[PDB]
């Protein structure tokens, strides 16, 4: 089943891809929303080893883990309930299919444009089977003022 409240002030998201500007904008949005914790718990980038990337929490300096594989990211962060996918039209399908293998993810945001309609229909079918809400591809995402922000929605700070 698909829930009604996709995002809250405690929502934790995993970002697929090396998008430092989008994650920093998300963190700035969280800080100006008086959130207790950043909305991004970890990042997934398959073309590098696991490490820590440096980000800003207001003026404080924080570290966000970056994992090569989805499995490690979901293992170390069971509190993550949202995936924001910054994969290309040639990788969004496989990454979303791999993500829907983890039950903790209830909402998936796909930013890529140009995905074939058949692959998108397969994604929709699997999401409906798993009860996972998908913000359709070729979108900036969404904004919930005070709770959560997806990707680059709403521009800069």
Which parts of this chain interact with other proteins (CB under 8 A)? Answer: 46-47, 49, 51-52, 54, 56, 59, 61, 68
State which residue, 7 or 67, has the beta carbon closest to other proteins: 67
- 114 vs 131, which CB is nearer to other proteins? 114
Give min distance, CB of 145 to other proteins, in A: 23
Provide the residue count of the chain: 157
What distance in Å separates the CA atoms of residue 32 and residue 124, rounded to the nearest whole number? 34
Least separation, in Å, of the C-beta of 59 and other proteins? 6
- 2 or 51: whose CB is closer to other proteins? 51
Q: Give the integer Cα–Cα distance in Å for 142 and 157.
A: 15
Alpha helices in the chain (DSSP H): 20-32, 70-76, 92-99, 117-130
In the complex, least distance from residue 20 CB atom to other proteins, rounded to whole angstroms: 10
How many other C-beta atoms lie within 10 A of the C-beta of residue 121?
A: 10
Beta bridge partners of 62: 55
Return the number of the residue (42 or 127) whose C-beta is nearest other proteins: 42
C-alpha pair distances (Å), 8 with each of 12, 38, 39, 116: 9, 12, 10, 32
Nearest-approach distance from CB 45 to other proteins, in angstroms: 9
């Amino acid at each position: 089943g698909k829930s009604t409240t996709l995002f809250s002030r405690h929502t934790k998201a995993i970002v697929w891809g090396m998008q430092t500007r989008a994650v920093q904008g998300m963190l700035d949005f969280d800080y100006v929303c008086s959130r207790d914790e950043p909305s991004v718990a970890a990042m997934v980038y398959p073309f590098t080893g696991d490490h820590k990337q440096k980000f800003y929490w207001g003026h404080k300096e924080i570290l966000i883990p970056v994992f090569k594989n989805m499995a490690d990211a979901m293992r170390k962060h069971p509190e993550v309930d949202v995936l924001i996918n910054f994969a290309s039209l040639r990788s969004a399908y496989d990454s979303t299919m791999e993500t829907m293998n983890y039950a903790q993810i209830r909402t998936i945001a796909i930013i890529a444009e140009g995905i074939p309609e058949a692959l998108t229909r397969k994604l929709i079918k699997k999401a409906d089977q798993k009860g996972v809400t998908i913000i359709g591809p070729a979108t900036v995402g969404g904004i919930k003022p005070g709770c959560f922000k997806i990707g680059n929605t709403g521009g800069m700070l």
